[PDB]
């Protein structure tokens, strides 16, 4: 009674094409461009892990702003409603939520001019459940099944080995 | 150069010689009942400046404490600094500091003056009044209220004592957080609080949702008798939507 | 006789900053505010006397010497003013020309201090100080002159005695010269709408902008004493009936009480006038000052007619 | 004079502050009070602060998250109270906030971090994990009633368990 | 006797002029000779004046140099004291004035001016007074900077002799004599006509500078040397007043309108000179207009005296004719102070414009103090020597006000009102002059590199300022010594002024705020002179310094018709040959022909 | 679609010059024209079509279409709509023809795009540095997206000011009277150079942008959409809610966000509460500058009633913090309705007594009548806004010409005068107090019901519109481009006195130094609004 994308480890080669394809379709839409499926590699096989779109959905239980609902059999997190409280990343038992925020638009990472002393560097990244940069509002980033896109999930379409497919159990 | 700079040419705060700075206690004693204040707007948004004007108002009257706003820095005992010190306002602020009799009391007024405020890291400012001149008194607020300005002036002149103090890390830090409204379902409380913020805003929504769920924990007759006491139609509108949310949850 | 005139000079200097306190209290009451006490100006002068006197680098001894010169000039005027007696304490300084040219000394020194600092605001305020002094002298001299003509003498003692033993037949020239001298007293006290030199909100109170510390304190004290001696020239000559013709120790207390009440009522009426309007400009002031010269000329014509 | 009637008709409008307090509205946005017990170190308020009055620093050496509120930075907008999940931070009606030392502006907290069960790297505030565990226990959860070590695991290590 | 003293003075002046002309190949030696001889001749002239004023009787005699009849009345002894006390320090100034590379020898011109002036004072015949006044006027117009600045002086100064020669011919025809003693006896039955008096007053005011016959005065003073300009303002313009007072007081019988005309003309001269000075930036043109203001005050005194003679009121005669003459002598003193000090500032800087002359008070401090004394003396601020004669003229104005004659009662308060206006304008002008010259920052590099004045310059200016302070403070004693010239008691109307009480009270009374600042000075940090003036936090530019142009714009607005009267009443386009190319040069050539033939015929 | 007839007239006059046109709102049209026909198009829409130049600005769109973009927003006021004239400027050669030789209102944004963007308006008569300070380094343009980091603070190139001032009507024989940056009347820093002949202003130049902090760079680097609402509250502490509302209804206008009807009227009410304190601040300072310090005290005593209303309605006295994108953050329960209704009726009887003691002030008529005259055709050419142009006879007002928030449902009356002097600019502001009290009294009696915000919406990237609020000193035009779901791409703010300052020179000519603080105060200057 839920819709999600699952990966096959015996078919996946760990090329990270799906991570780039998921990043591009959300960057064009203005959403968070962090990849919502992450490729994990034991030394023997590999498969990207993403949101299971659970029936009980413990992330939606602990959300203090009700940003996480169920739409069309899919657990959907409202990115504009999230207040970055990061409770959903603890409650998720599958590690499907990490935390990234939008950086300034079309401004390079090293934008320092030689005409001034350089800007203070960013703090060292420990964990997205703990990091905070003053210009960056790191909100919860999970798979939304590319529901804005008419072609469906971009990770499934751009997988060369067809290791990803949707499980439409509705 | 009007102000001191570092090896990179970036301006640094002006020090005050120890012989001159050892007289600030005596100046603070003798300006208790007669204080002359020169306002130095170093690049604020005018919010701080016009609550100083409202501290000269008939309602909030600062002259009864012996505080007179002076036309020139030459007359000043207290130099009142507002603003994040913009680049075009560094040199006039230092000129007002230098064309004033020594010793001088510096009151940093407002968040912008205290640390830069909301512009604490911008390119065309310096980040507060302590980045150019030493500061005796910090008055926070964006802008401070004229009551806060009166309190800061009276605390600088020694008529009143400082009330707030720093809170360091202690042991409450590890005493665990309590669940809000633990006698009810927490996603329902989230939905009720979000619906009450939609209709009433964050400030009234939290007050209305907390009161409504407190009355709902006792009974529906308890909610209805609470609405009769308030006798506000807008609150009846909001509690009707909250009841609709509670009924949709059931 | 070398003590009455100096005792009067010491008494007026010491109280001059209390009449400024009535002025600043009545200003606060007309601003609908509680305001400070009557000793705020003294509290402000004593604080400034222990404050460092600074100045511009392009200034010399004139800038440092002017406040003490103006205080000494006002003390010199105050020894010759009838306060508790009808006659002057020092009648050889009591000529109206003498007391008019003594005031010109302090306006000259005020104007050269504003040209010594090099500021545009101080120099423009010096320029207004001297120009208001230009504009007000015809009316003040013609009023005092008409009173001296109705008194047979330019001495302030004899003018005060003639207003005291008021003549009645020469009532119209005396009343019109009194109105001219009252208006002249209001302009010479630098009171709004004629505060064209120390015009904060324009010149950062003019030549006072460069003064600091003890120099600013002695300047504020000289301004207060100048206002006191101008108002005392009016109210101790044209309202002399609380004074006494011969000095007695028994009648001294009532004379000081009536002199203090006259000064307080004068600064209260003056406060009611200055806190109730906008200040003028220097290009429109001559029409109003020529109109006071008019009250004085009407006085002068009413002496020629009769 | 119309000005003199106006002055006489008004009277004295000056209050007696500081002798008698000056009333501010029940919902006046004064100083943000902060309950350190109710705070879970979630930095939701830190992410919503426009003037960066709220800062967190991850101090690995002390194994803690350094929560801090700076009153000299605060623009008194109330967004911390708006986005707070536990309602730990709230704007009071206090306005008498002037200091002599700007260190007195600081409201500091230090919450112990939680090391991951698998990689022993500090990944989250232990207080926030305890609050999430209590929240799931309140809604009826067995993963919270029996398995706290799954909540004290980092999301990368929780993604490694799904690989098998 | 005083006749031998004045003969020695005339001989020393003539020998000084001759040996200054012959030894003019070395300018320093010529200046030393001219200054020493002029100082000795001025000492003899002042000694003769003091002798005649102390003896309280006129002396008679003749000069041994040429056949020149001499009467020295006590009235003319004040002019002798004036001339000697000016020319002594003017010549001692001239000694170090001849050390400048850009100046020329002038001691022949200066000492011939002094000799002709002294012989005009001690003149017996009115025709001879008109001869020595023109010898002085030619020796004065040759002291100008160039031919362009003495063209109007040659035109007006000879016009005034054509009128004086017509008046003297008319006196010869009506009385058969020009001796002043004989004319005084012959006009106790037949009075002096008003046509003769009008011609003489217009001709002498063309030399004394009565406005509007004053047109040569600022041109003449504009770029002349400092001893020359000081002698113009203190000697040459005072001989015309001597002629006016001589002609007005012959017969002791004056018409009423003579004194009335003198008072109006004096009021016109005083107010117009004091107002026109406040619109000048050349210091010497300003001091020329201020010489005109003081000439107007001396006539307000002399006209009050003549009006009292006409109304037979001896108190008015005494007050007017003592205040005017005391103001005349003390004006000469402080006008000499100001012209010599401004010339010292020009000596050290090269500038007569005070807009290019900032901050001289720190570079020339002794000169700055003496100039301050002179400028306060000219504003008639007590207890200096300008207030001493002006206070007495106000007492004469009060005597005019309480008279029976309706014209005296009408003019009396009005002349006092005008004198108050003139004094306030004077205070404004001296505030401007001391502020933009000796105060503030320097405005040119010449004002920065000014050093102290030379020794005899400083001695002359300081000694003249000391004489100004003496004539101010000791005025209650020096004023009754003029009762020899006017044998009448001085009666102010139930009032008195004591300048020593004002002197002691303007120094002791400022010590009291100093005493209280020294008591209430707890830990006040010492005084600071650190930076620029406060211009609201911006950088202080040179254009933020308000100068003499912007200080006196309100008097250009509030006295617009009087300042515009200088352009409507000017008959410069109505004279046909005035705008010719070589008119000033031809005026100069026939000036030396007239001076040459006059010197040739007067030795005969 | 409003402005179709204007687009047809533009295509009829200059065939082919319009390349691309699009509608962002039903009353907002943006046309893309050829770069070298830009001064003819803006002059055509300015004089032939009777438009008013609201804001002109640059946009670093080199990563969108490879070109710098200069927008030229024209307010059609002969229904009324907006026309934005857009050109594409080459990135390698940032040169475009200047509109200032044809439209005199174009002098300052063309000076601003030199400073913030480095574009070169060819033919601009005044190339003086305007927005950047004197110690800012050359060829360092902060609003370019790759030129510099927003946290970088360069070393000052100088400590003394290097700005050059223009004295047209005078000579070097004039003195200068520096009013500001730290004058008594300088409530906020602004330096005014009075080229005087004594006490008569021959000509007047001025240096501003002392208060410039770099706010438009902060809005696209460290701030999110909802954080600029509090940043816009700090553009100017006097009209901060005007900036807050103009920013909020430009993101919402770009996205088509349907704000609830209750939030729009409370936005319209608090824009009038902000108007109440600002006009009494100006009227009190107008009394203050003439020496009438009692009128300064009287007007600031009544101003505290509106500050009490602002504290009741918003929770703060001045910096309201009311607007979020999609709605407002506070409701009005009855103690809020009851107290503010009492205070608004208290304010009306109490302002009326102050106007009587202001028009009967003994020297207020000779200080204000005929002083600081703004010539009406000078005000048309430079596109002056608000009470300063409404006193000059041009009855233009945003709340009426371009209706926004809940102003279509409020009793609006446009107040204009015909005398062009200090007193009439006060008389516009006096009459606007009574109209603001009328809309507050009606608004507090006729509030709609329903929610206060919408939320959960997503921002579509690279969407833009105009945001306009009528600030107390005239129109406040904001232009926001959405960058992604969290951050903006470009936020331009143009305040009222930015359109009103360039005619201060003609207003200060022929007056006195004692009149000069009053003439500046009559412009009702908001320096922090101008500088940002
Ligand atoms: S602290 Fe706030 S109100 Fe004060 S100047 Fe800064 S931004 Fe404006
Ligand atoms: N009012 C206001 Fe502020 C300005 N100028 C805006 O917009
Ligand atoms: Fe881990
Ligand atoms: Ni503003």
Numbering used by the authors:
A (entry chain B): 1 to 170
B (entry chain G): 4 to 253
C (entry chain D): 2 to 307
D (entry chain F): 2 to 165
E (entry chain C): 2 to 605
F (entry chain E): 5 to 82, 84 to 537
Quote the study that presented this structure, word for word.
The prototypical hydrogen-producing enzyme, the membrane-bound formate hydrogenlyase (FHL) complex from Escherichia coli, links formate oxidation at a molybdopterin-containing formate dehydrogenase to proton reduction at a [NiFe] hydrogenase. As the pH of the growth medium drops, formate re-enters the cell and synthesis of the formate-hydrogen lyase (FHL) complex is induced. This heptameric membrane-bound complex catalyzes the disproportionation of formate to CO2 and H2 allowing efficient production of hydrogen from biomass, a process that was first described over 100 years ago5. The FHL complex exhibits the characteristic L-shaped structure of the complex I superfamily with membrane-embedded and soluble arms. An electron relay containing eight [4Fe4S] clusters, coordinated by FdhF (A1), HycB (B1-B4), HycF (F1, F2) and HycG (G1), leads from the molybdopterin site to a [NiFe] hydrogenase active site in HycE.
We developed an anaerobic isolation protocol that allowed us to purify a complex exhibiting 20-fold higher hydrogen-uptake activity (6201 ± 1445 s−1) compared to aerobically purified complex from this study (253 ± 164 s−1) and previous studies (2.44 ± 0.62 U mg−1 ≡ 13 s−1). The structure of the anaerobically isolated complex was determined at an average resolution of 2.6 Å. The formate dehydrogenase subunit FdhF, which shows partial occupancy in the aerobically purified complex, was entirely absent in the anaerobically isolated complex in multiple replicates of the purification. In line with its higher hydrogen-uptake activity, the map derived from anaerobically prepared sample had stronger and higher-resolution density for the nickel-iron active site in HycE and the proximal iron-sulfur cluster G1 in HycG. The ND3 loop (HycC TMH15-THM16 loop), β1-β2 loop (HycE β8-β9 loop), NDUFS7 loop (HycG residues 69-80) and the ND1 loop (HycD TMH5-TMH6 loop) are all well-resolved in our anaerobic cryo-EM map and could be modeled with confidence. The structure of anaerobically isolated FHL shows the arginine in a single conformation facing the metal ion. Additional density between the helix HL and TMH7 of HycC could be confidently assigned as cardiolipin (CDL). Arg567, Tyr290, His215, Gln220 and Asn571 of HycC interact with the headgroup of CDL, whereas non-polar residues in the broken helix in TMH7 interact with the alkyl chains. In FHL the Glu193 is too far (4 Å) from Cys531-S to allow direct proton transfer, suggesting that the β1-β2 loop is likely flexible during turnover.
